[model samples]
Target: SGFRKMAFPSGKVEGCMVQVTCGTTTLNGLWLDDVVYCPRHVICTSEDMLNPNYEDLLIRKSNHNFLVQAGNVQLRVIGHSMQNCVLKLKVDTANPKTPKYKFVRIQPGQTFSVLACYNGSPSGVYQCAMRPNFTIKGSFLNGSCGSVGFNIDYDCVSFCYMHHMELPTGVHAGTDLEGNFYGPFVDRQTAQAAGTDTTITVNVLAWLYAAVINGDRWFLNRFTTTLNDFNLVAMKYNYEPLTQDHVDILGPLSAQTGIAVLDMCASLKELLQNGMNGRTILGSALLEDEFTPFDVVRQCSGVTF
Candidate 1:
């Protein structure tokens, strides 16, 4: 870090021997034994080589060493050689449009991460990504580092913050700054626009996303197994008559949603396979229903409630 002024032509120096003259006298040649030099003789450090790029990193997921506090989705850092590492974090929720960010600091060990509230948030999945600052803490190393991100799956219906009873021990919940849980609770009619895909096509998706987030493992199986079947059925029924079998196929969703079902389960079926982003919107739309995703979706699909 203690660099002095020197006169040398700009070049990439790698283990190169050089003779230097200073103060009107030759300071003799110094062989760069195991040194690497950059232009203008700026000193480089090992930390500068650490890359910071990461994606879908499962930030709060299970991992050894670091401890995850499931209560507020907190993470305790430990055993890393890097200290005061500056990290830029991004937290993505089920909604694709409005995620969030923050700058976080991590040390070698024994540190707690501060992030937005994940507890008592909506029932959905979230993602967190981290990017480390390239410059060193005390000095400018001048280099690059990689980014890391992760995922969080939350279920509001059945899942509760039980860290008081049992703490989840693992990696940190990623994100220092992230967007609102469900985009600030829009008006029912305002959110109705997304539902206009002939309507139920988008609204019913909210119920499924909620189910996927909160229901048991069997629920996941139910959704994934029927993805292809629903995709074709939805297409077939868009213009065709509602077969008794189609009604039978949709019967189970009734238990989840309430008494009155869809005008055409066809649109609902389309939303089913729209993937997470579509379900995200549906989830938010349904959030206003009984403060439940199901009720919201149910009423949006023309239920009396």
Candidate 2:
């Protein structure tokens, strides 16, 4: 019908709303009156976004987009648009700044997530689109996006998606030399887009191992660069490293870097497939070497990885 004001903690009524109709047993996409307003919280997951209990309208036009969920060390975004969407998690401050958190790109209908270890609870803060429309809000919510900060959570699963571990189609997938089916992504973007953090990372480690085993230097170097770039971006955003497990994971292989690509690949295979007290355990065997460049970056960031 019409928009109404939503009250905030300050006892001020400045929020807007829109009404819609529900039929049968579900509600399709609902539209907000304007682009500036969003749900205060976006606590979404791959499961919820993919196999959402309900659906949203297929197409709409606006400079701003809606966020679905909130809270959690990990921040995830599901792309429900036919066109590719970019979700920018920016600084939730009340001032004018670069608004740095991270940017996640979702191919038309694909979903992506990130290890945006924000301070305190997720808080449902920040904006989804990267470009700021100061004409509307005048410098990003009047520079009061709410003082948001982020960090790396290597084991948090999503930490990789933001790292370019995902293919344009979806998660990186290929069988290893052992005929082991690993990390295959389903185009469940419109269906059930369901998978866990461990599901993706374990398979990623496996893919890297297979590539090195096959002497696929092209892939090894490519992903190595990708990993490096991902961490570099993180550092540029002033993010901190999350865990120390990376040290133990790459303990024996820290000596391998850059020109040592060949030697490094071999040691890495050993560390991941079989290392003492290794963290990753896929059944009886141990492929504990799932360390990402984020670890090394964490160390450089002054954290004792």
Candidate 3:
């Protein structure tokens, strides 16, 4: 039979103190004020909540919004509020510049459900409703209404540049297939005739294979050994034209465990046979395993490649 007291500088009636009494241990707090006073709302992943440095994970954008680094999270609403509020969840899709969101209304006890290399979670944003006079306290839980958690993935360009092949000069990284070169050109002369005078249109898979072989010692050594064997055979046969038998023996061995080399070779040979000569191959022709063409317009929408 005891009471807890709280004061609201701008309550529903403005400038009032409220008190309430409750006996149940299950009861957290009681709200007597006319206006809701839900304070200390935090949006964070359940895992981060247990960490000692969890406070560092939250970023305060505004009184009603928070940027949390998480794949998925619970928006913990604390304090005394008799009214329900809404939480908006925003997610970044292929176009990171513009994010899409949905709204979920929450009461005393409720939860909500909501890829890419992005700054925030690949799936994350949120804003909550609060009175204009409401004030926030504490370090992490600064929201007066609700907090939002964001899923953080690797930055798109950063991941591609570090783990994959580099984009050609003047080309920036993006999910779009623009500014990418598809090939028929094995040499530079054909590319120049096709009006891509600045840079030769080369096969992406070829570039990647060559990149892998050059960087890895094992692949480089294997390549050299195979080529040396072919040279010895050629010498023994007095430089006869390579027959189908010779091709059958050397092809798979040279390809080794890297299937990409075979893919690249086949694609190039097909393009040549098809008379793709000086024409730039369509972006749709690119294989899934190959690098996507950079979209200079999309990547540098605000800036440049």
TM-scores, all candidates, are 0.19, 0.26, 0.17
lDDT of 3 by residue, 1-305 (tens): 11111111111111111111121101011111122111121233334323323234333223224332222332222222111111122222222222222222221111111111122212222211111111111112111112121111122111010000112232211111111122221111111222222111121332333333334222222222233444344334232222344334333323643543334344433433353334333222321111111111111122221
lDDT per residue, candidate 1, 192-220, as tens digits? Answer: 11110122232234344334334311223
TM-score of 1: 0.19
Better of 1 and 3 by TM-score: 1
Off by over 4 Å in 3: 1-119, 124-267, 273-305
The local distance difference test score of each candidate is 0.24, 0.25, 0.22
Better of 1 and 2 by lDDT: 2
